[PDB]
Amino acid sequence: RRHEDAIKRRKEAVNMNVEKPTVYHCKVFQFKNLQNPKIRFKLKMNSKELSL
RNA sequence: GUUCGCGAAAUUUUACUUCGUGGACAUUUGGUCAAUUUGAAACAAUACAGAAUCAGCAGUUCCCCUGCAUAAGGAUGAACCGUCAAAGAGAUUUGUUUU
């Protein structure tokens, strides 16, 4: 019961929005070849997951 | 003066009676049942020391095991890639192998 109420509580963590930070943090990477398909998949996934 | 013991006499050895002899030879206290009875104050009633035991759970304090929550923190896997929708008006082009 506490486990399910936790998820019904998680949805309120979903509809919470931004509250923009102060300083954005940036990194720059550079590569010779992106052709590897799984790398191309992971860079998309992990970008969507972390809200990067 | 009281008793116990030994020796002598009068009678039937122990016994009574008397002489010579060795001890022992104080009284009290520390001894109240408590409780209850309308009277010039006594111990007379009225009781009468009879004036509960086995077992179960839980709760505080620490420890371990296993869950779920929460705060932080990490490790890894997931094949395919992003600068609109509708309607209206104007401008340009368009004989035989795969229908």
Rounded CA-CA distance A2/A9 in Å is 10
Q: Per the structure block, which two tokens stand in for A20?
A: 């923009």
Which nucleotides of chain B have an atom under 7 angstroms from any protein CB? 68-70, 77-82
Rounded CA-CA distance A49/A26 in Å is 17
- Taken in order A6, A7, A10, A15, the sign of the CA dihedral is negative
**Which nucleotide's C1' sits nearest to the alpha carbon of A34?**
B81
Q: Is the CB of residue A40 less than 8 Å from the CB of residue A34?
A: yes
Letter string b/e over residues A8-33, b meaning 16 or more CB atoms within 10 A of that residue's CB: eeeeeeeeeeeeeeeeeeeeeeeeee
Q: Per the structure block, which two tokens stand in for A7?
A: 């998820």
What DSSP line would sit under chain A, residue for residue? -HHHHHHHHHHHHHS------SS--------S----HHHHHHHHHHHHHTT-
- Nominal resolution (angstroms): 3.4
Q: Per the structure block, which two tokens stand in for A23?
A: 């300083």
